[PDB]
Design a protein around this ligand. Structure first.
Ligand SMILES: Nc1ncnc2c1ncn2[C@@H]1O[C@H](COP(=O)(O)OP(=O)(O)OP(O)(O)=S)[C@@H](O)[C@H]1O
Ligand SMILES: Nc1ncnc2c1ncn2[C@@H]1O[C@H](COP(=O)(O)OP(=O)(O)OP(O)(O)=S)[C@@H](O)[C@H]1O
Ligand SMILES: Nc1ncnc2c1ncn2[C@@H]1O[C@H](COP(=O)(O)OP(=O)(O)OP(O)(O)=S)[C@@H](O)[C@H]1O
Lengths: 734, 734
């Protein structure tokens, strides 16, 4: 008794697609007999659990075709997004689709179908197709010039449903109005599965290029590699943050290639007892060997190959890893098969799968930067941009600037929640709203992301508030010094590379606490015209595996790898103290990392290391001397006019001037109050404001008078003396 | 009711000769019945997780044949390289394999079969064989008149749904041509497993023969010891750094020796249920006793048999070690059983497990010598085709001498990376180039070696901007003496050896700050070729009771493992406080650990120490003693002719001579300057020049004139008199 397989395997149809064989997917005649299916008859082909698609049953050769294999012309696989290795469910159809009266025909790129190709050849393809559902493609179509490939998609067909993903219509010549259209997708109401192509993967062009090379080299041309007697780089591994296009990159690799896509599912490949896990792995790799070229995907390989050094690993992990070691290192030198693995983090995968010959090639998928978010946002925003009509591309930069932490996944969730808030905006404006009349808006998008948890954390990007050289409080002497000395060496970069001389290394920005110290570095991050970076004091300084001597190296590597940078070292004096008999901290590592990084082989073409301090006498002597820091200047608390404009800056939502006391009046009233202490006076006044009216009021002069009492003179002569004592040393050769 | 085994134990036939029993697998009657494998019918037997071998089933004697065992001939086992004790599946094949048309036969020995044997012999062998598959070896066939015996191999088989490891074919006398060949292995098309052999192991010759002796006598000649009234040595332990080839030895021992082969793959036996790990060990040793002779392998013994006295070893480790101890020497007997184990940490193995009677022998497997590395490289490169282009001896000998501290895994990685480099160069030439002819040229090996790191050196991070002797201005005396120390003793080894003289193995470079002290160490590092470990003064002054001495000892351990190597102790004055009043530092014992490591009860052969101090008399007389720091070199300030060379080096990208800037005047007027101050002079003149312009202003003598006005002489006459005084009491006749 012949046994009918439950699931059939999609595979190419060596016959051409231009013929009458569009929906005549050849089926093994034994299956045709065993399922009461007549030749040239319609039957439903579809993935498990999905709505069916219509194919015409045609008998194939018994010997050539194995029983399971079902061959589809490449026109119908694109209907239901049938990629190779997709298990099917053959069933017998019962209703013959009616003929067609109108068909709207699309194109890939919007090319004028009238101008490029004849109507006769298009009609020939369509008629010979016989039955047309919305969603196929007619490929490799020769044009009038003979050198252009334009593909005929079909947007819709109308005649003047259940368990069918789309209802076809039997295209017949004579009255079918073939009205060509610029739409690049099938009819939207049915929503036939959209391919996840390369143009939906934005933000990882370099990484996708590396992945493409790693897939092509073992997949298409392993023979010429194998002549050398050492196995190809079959094993590729993807790792990085657990939100950045990992499974999506695997899915696009599945879609684009024409290589038989197998899949090593994590949980479902394993049944029970013995000889089931190894049986599954053997069978799947053997099938990937029979049908070539093939890709073997292992998404989240960690869930089945932990280190065996953790209590998680049991018998099953030992089975999976042993079988994979036996297989992946055994096959080769002729098989056109690649194994691609991805993981949230790779470091917990058994090394036996990581040695060369096993997964040894790597693709690093990294956090998207501020400039990286633009492509993600715009391409994500494409699916309905015709109904956005709001972008104009400028809000996208703002979003990218304010989404430090989002990993692309959260950006897509932001799109989802924005669409929700647009639906609810339509409902709130009018209960019986028409959503299609709505264009999404940035205000409701803001009302949207104000209710999502952003991401894991922010690593190389900070708030970086907008500060300008046009607003920094007075101190035109400070301004002129910092310009002359930190922008000139950042201008002369090639002229140092030629003439062979290293560039000045950095400035230390002497000054008492609470000044514009780093708030000027905020302008460096806003209006310098040069990208910025910082570590706000002893974050990296702490004693951890990746902080003792590693995080400094990573920070410098990111900064140097970028365009010129003004890397910042807030309170370097407190970070690494003198440690020469006075204030001996226990780190001993971070200063060594800085010493080995700043002075060494690295290029550091576009890099200047700025730092900040309020107790400069505590800096390690290895920094003051030229070689690590060789520029040195002093920042003072704001002068009377700088204090005028800092007083202006403190207020952001108060009307003291017109109602109360002029801000201009306060300019000289504030003496001994540092840039972060005039803030203290203003904030004490603001807290006192909510004590008199308690709901809504201006402030009083006496509020600022109480600010004067409650906060004594901040900038006292002690710091003047301590500085000038240190400055007679720093300023002079002593 | 009868329960068929889930996995089956391989075993040999009692009959060693060739007949109609050859391709027959003797399976138990009940198992035959339960899979319905009717006697005489075809069945497939193959390791779990691999493709099967077709074998024709017979019955075993139901009372003396164990249920688990299938017995297979050496001919069949040669196909899949099935070692005795391998766990086989057994599955019915409802098939009749195809007839043969042309069968190819070869011989391991490569001798002409027409000359050695009569074709009727081969015809009879094949006819009786019943089945033909590529990969079969018919061993011990006698030559003409019994001259010798030859092994004959079925290299290929051709005929003009199950899946098999080798194609099954049938021999039908006369109608299938027995075509001879000289290929000593089966056709490479088939991916047949290829036996690993001792010829693939490099070096370790004496260790290999020790393994041969301790494997052969206990298993294959015990009555010799029973005759001599002594017990057999039932234990071998292999210890040595990782990557030296310990598992390779175990696999070759498994595949070469004719014995029941069992493996405890450390964590593979472990279970979370109370007594199951111990029960796995008992079953393994009882199986070894049952089928004799038997070899039991334990790779990483330390993973399952820890010290049993240390803190983390609780009751579970105690019970597992007790099981191992009692199964090796207890109230039970051993039999013809030998246990072979491997470990990277011999002292972490339980001390009572290494006593004679258990692991009697400890065959050390250490890092390779230059001869050993040459052997490994020749055997690795013998695996390739005639695309090597590395002269079998010369180029490989250069690569072997240039590899210092390599262990053997890294050498295989180097060969694979060389293949990678050659083929990426091929891709960079053109994508469609005929790669196979892209011989790996020695420069490809060089490009590969710069991208690999010796096993003993992954953790030795260095920035090391590739300093060369010519960078050091002058100092010809120091250069000559450092050539004496580092280079010559290896480039003239036989001369020193024949004179009975070991070259001095310590030097102290002392002199004012900013001379060529550290730069000469870096020049040695990046010109001597040998490894180079670096240390600094206060980086190894942890504040715990014994953590600094541990740093010293770890450094010297790595230096020994990576010898030839330099250890450069910059700021050796930090490591040498007397603490009696001279350098009254903390109560640390770093000096003593350094003293004992340099010259103690252990010898420290092969390492050379270079120490640099700018305060030479603050060093202990014991450390300056010959045998610790033999030669004391005074690296003083550069004289005029060295200054001129410095200026020529750094100013070459200036157009000084085209501008009339006479370097003679600069050299003469920079008298008594520190050489670092000469470099500073030129770099500061460059700053001055490129401060007037953002474009390239060629330096001018007046910018140098400005420079001279600021750079103070860092070397006072006091320092010079001090160092010249130390250069009289020590390292001088006085
Ligand atoms: N360039 C991009 N970077 C990141 N995500 C993107 C990008 N482009 C689109 N996305 C969307 O990101 C969403 C989530 O990405 P996924 O790859 O599915 O997450 P993941 O890679 O599975 O993460 P894990 O937990 O490490 S497996 C998808 O629905 C994509 O539509
Ligand atoms: N002559 C050789 N000596 C050493 N290794 C060799 C040699 N020839 C090849 N190799 C390779 O080097 C490795 C030797 O096996 P390894 O298991 O890595 O050594 P081992 O680390 O001492 O054993 P372990 O730690 O129990 S896995 C393998 O990857 C071999 O392919
Ligand atoms: N012949 C030379 N004499 C002195 N310095 C030289 C010479 N040639 C080059 N230099 C440069 O001068 C500087 C001297 O640096 P080092 O070699 O570290 O001197 P050093 O005496 O080891 O300093 P220490 O160890 O901190 S006391 C480096 O920038 C060298 O590149």
């Amino acid at each position: 008794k012949f046994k009918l397989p439950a699931e059939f395997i999609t595979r190419p149809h060596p016959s051409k697609d231009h013929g009458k064989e569009t929906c005549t997917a050849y089926i093994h005649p034994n299956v045709l007999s065993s399922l009461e299916i007549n030749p040239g008859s319609f039957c439903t082909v579809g993935k498990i659990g999905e709505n069916g698609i219509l194919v015409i049953a045609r008998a194939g050769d018994e010997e050539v075709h194995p029983v399971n294999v079902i061959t589809l012309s490449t026109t119908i696989r694109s209907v239901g997004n049938l990629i190779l290795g997709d298990r099917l469910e053959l069933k017998k159809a019962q209703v013959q689709p009616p003929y067609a009266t109108k068909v709207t025909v699309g194109s890939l790129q919007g090319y004028n179908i009238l101008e490029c190709m004849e109507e006769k050849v298009i009609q020939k393809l369509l008629d010979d197709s016989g039955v047309i559902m919305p969603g196929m493609i007619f490929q490799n179509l020769k044009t009038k010039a003979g050198d252009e490939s334009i593909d005929v998609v079909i947007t819709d067909a109308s005649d003047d449903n259940l368990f069918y993903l789309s209802p076809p219509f039997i295209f017949r010549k004579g009255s079918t109005h073939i009205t060509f259209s610029k739409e690049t997708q099938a009819n939207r109401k049915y929503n036939l599965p959209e391919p996840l192509s390369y143009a939906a993967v934005g933000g990882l062009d370099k990484e996708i290029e590396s992945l493409k090379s790693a897939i092509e080299i073992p997949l298409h041309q392993p023979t010429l590699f194998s002549s050398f007697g050492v196995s190809p780089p079959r094993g590729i591994l993807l790792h990085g943050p657990p939100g950045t296009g990992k499974t999506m990159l695997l899915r696009v690799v599945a879609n684009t290639s024409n290589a038989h896509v197998l899949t090593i599912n994590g949980p479902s490949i394993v049944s029970k007892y013995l000889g089931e896990t190894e049986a599954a792995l053997r069978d799947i790799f053997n099938e990937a060997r029979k049908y070539q070229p093939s890709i073997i995907f292992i998404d989240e390989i960690d869930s089945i190959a932990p280190n065996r050094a953790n209590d998680d690993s049991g018998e099953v992990e030992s089975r999976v890893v042993a079988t994979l070691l036996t297989l992946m290192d055994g096959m080769g030198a002729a098989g056109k098969v690649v194994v691609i693995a991805a993981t949230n983090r790779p470091n917990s995968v058994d090394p036996a799968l990581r040695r060369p010959g096993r997964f040894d090639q790597e693709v690093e998928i990294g956090i998207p930067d501020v400039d990286a978010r633009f492509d993600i946002l715009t391409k994500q925003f494409s699916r309905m941009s015709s109904d956005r009509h709001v972008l104009d591309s400028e809000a996208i930069k703002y979003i990218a600037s304010k989404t430090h932490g989002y990993v692309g996944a959260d950006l897509t969730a932001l799109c989802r929640e924005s669409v929700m808030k647009t639906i609810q905006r339509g409902l709130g404006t009018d209960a019986n709203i028409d959503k299609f009349s709505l264009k999404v808006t940035l205000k409701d998008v803001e009302s949207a992301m104000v209710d999502i948890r952003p991401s894991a954390m922010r690593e190389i990007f900070l708030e970086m508030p907008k500060v300008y050289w046009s607003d920094i409080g007075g101190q035109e002497e400070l301004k002129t010094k910092m310009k002359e000395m930190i922008q000139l060496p950042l201008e002369a970069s090639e002229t140092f590379a030629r003439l062979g001389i290293s560039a000045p290394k950095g400035v230390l920005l002497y000054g008492p606490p609470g000044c514009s110290k780093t708030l000027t570095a905020k302008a460096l991050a806003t209006e310098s015209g040069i990208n910025f970076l910082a570590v706000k004091g002893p974050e990296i300084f702490n004693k951890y595996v990746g902080e003792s001597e590693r995080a400094i190296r990573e920070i410098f590597r990111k900064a140097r790898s970028a365009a010129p940078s003004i890397i910042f070292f807030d309170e370097i004096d407190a970070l690494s103290p003198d440690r020469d008999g006075s204030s001996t901290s226990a780190a001993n590592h971070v200063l060594t990392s800085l010493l080995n990084e700043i002075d060494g082989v690295e290029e550091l073409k576009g890099v200047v290391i700025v730092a900040a301090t309020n107790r400069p006498d505590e800096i390690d002597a290895a920094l003051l001397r030229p070689g690590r820091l060789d520029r040195h200047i002093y920042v003072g608390p704001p002068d009377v006019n700088a204090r005028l404009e800092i007083l202006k800056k403190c207020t952001k939502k108060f009307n003291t001037e017109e109602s109360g006391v002029d801000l201009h009046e306060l300019a000289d009233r504030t003496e001994g109050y540092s840039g972060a202490e005039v803030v203290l006076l203003c904030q004490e006044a603001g807290l006192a404001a909510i004590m008199e009216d308690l709901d809504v009021a201006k402030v009083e002069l006496r509020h600022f008078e109480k600010a004067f009492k409650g906060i004594a003179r901040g900038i006292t002569p002690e710091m003047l003396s301590y500085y000038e004592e240190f400055a007679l040393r720093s300023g002079s050769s002593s």
